[PDB]
């Protein structure tokens with residue numbers, strides 16, 4: 001049961017973006033593919049472990065709303081091959097080209113993101129960076145969740161606007177939980193329903209960090225659209241609760257959106 | 264890895280289709296899924312093996328033009344879960360509701376179908392039953408090859424006239440699908456006798472009427488179709504060539 005792709009089969013075309021954590025290219029392998037590969041000559045143990053982990057997580061996922069993993073390649077140079085996505089991120093849609101989705105679609109995008117996050121959490125995978133930049137709107141109608149580090153456009157301020165207060169505070173070595181993912185989703189729901197990023201009235205990054213952290217600052221829920229249903233606004237408020245253990249988990253979140261999805 | 268879905272996780276919903284070996288339902292498992300369940304709930308050794316073998320193949324595939332396997336269940340019943348396809352099969356579009364696609368889109372369907380088959384072959388997988396109803400036009404956009412079930416109209420003569428399966432026998436089936444796409448019809452529509460179709464195709468007396476292809480069908484395509492439908496097994500191209508051939512053809516067009 002292997003996923004290694006023999007060398008010389010992958011063609012690498014355009015370079016889409018580069019981090020210190022890898023370089024993404026558009027490529028060809030049995031069709032269009034994205035190739036994330038370490039541009040280095042000799043992978044260090046930490047990088048090789050980073051690679052083994054990403055592959056380990058990606059091959060546990062087979063769900064329509066998660067970016068399809070297709071193979072890896074160690075032979076010439078460490079590389080991960082996924083499906084090539086088409087269109088743009090949810091971030092780009094809401095905050096750059098400013099596309100205007102009907103309410104029926106906004107709610108759909110929520111639903112699908114919720115489906116995917118329910119799936120990850122069922123397999124006990126915590127994303128730790130769910131945000132509209134990492135939600136690709138494939139063919140303009142299927143949510144693909146991934147980690148698109150710099151392959152898609154950057155947020156205003158890592159990425160602070162989606163961090164739950166317990167994460168911002170950084171109380172201990174691991175403040176991440178299914179519930180921190182839920183809060184992040186909560187912000188994505190804010191984005192969908194408002195069309196905007198939170199805290200747009202504040203020009204200082206450290207102040208946002210400080211205040212969200214102490215519970216002094218929270219998303220202004222009055223900026224949601226008239227036609228956004230009360231169920232959705234209520235669910236949004238529950239997800240954004242400042243107390244981790246007061247937040248709902250995705251099975252219920254999914255169930256809530258599914259219910260308001262009819263009618 | 265392990266793809267066993269725990270018990271009482273999939274809510275089985277509407278029944279979609281039943282047929283001898285299996286029954287398939289629309290279900291809910293982190294969104295819509297399709298659940299295919301074994302009928303007789305005291306399964307026999309050979310049926311159990313069939314299940315093993317399907318899941319064995321299904322989990323070898325990760326490609327956008329292949330139906331997405333998601334998991335299996337053994338408790339209480341044997342069941343295989345895939346993604347749920349919204350839309351219609353290629354068979355249903357072309358022969359039941361008779362969708363009129365524009366040519367550019369028909370060529371794209373062939374591209375994608377060949378794209379998937381190319382993948383499958385690369386992993387030493389022979390489909391053995393490629394046909395229009397095993398091609399689902401997901402969301403009216405993305406082809407998903409699967410096996411959603413003899414299928415005589417798509418069998419190459421060497422198969423018809425009895426392991427005769429090969430990449431080439433898969434290619435012949437694809438040749439028939441191209442015919443379907445380009446004519447919007449099934450082959451041998453003027454013959455109503457199955458036994459005679461079997462005998463005649465096997466003897467080489469019968470082969471698809473390529474004059475029935477649409478007027479705007481490119482000559483390059485009509486030729487590829489003739490090559491994929493060659494009676495002799497070894498004269499048929501493999502999918503890398505087919506895909507390169509459709510590639511070139513589709514660029515002088517868009």
Ligand SMILES: CN(c1ccc(F)c(NC(=O)c2cccc(OC(C)(C)C#N)c2Cl)c1)c1ccc2nc(NC(=O)C3CC3)sc2n1
Nearest residue numbers: 024034036080082083084085086087127145146147148151
């Ligand atoms: C950046 N990118 C890409 C390519 C290969 C990869 F392996 C990854 N990796 C991940 O996304 C990733 C990393 C860590 C964990 C992880 O799993 C969980 C389950 C936590 C999640 N989510 C993942 Cl999934 C990323 C890609 C991939 C496709 C792609 N398509 C693009 N299309 C375009 O840019 C054109 C329209 C403009 S960019 C792109 N980047």
Ligand SMILES: CN(c1ccc(F)c(NC(=O)c2cccc(OC(C)(C)C#N)c2Cl)c1)c1ccc2nc(NC(=O)C3CC3)sc2n1
Nearest residue numbers: 287297299317343345346347348349350390408409410411
């Ligand atoms: C019938 N079906 C479905 C469900 C579960 C399954 F496991 C399979 N299996 C296969 O298709 C299959 C079987 C044997 C081998 C095999 O692999 C090869 C390599 C030959 C291939 N390809 C496979 Cl892949 C099939 C499904 C699945 C989705 C689905 N969606 C539907 N939607 C609708 O009918 C309504 C919108 C109109 S029906 C359906 N059936």
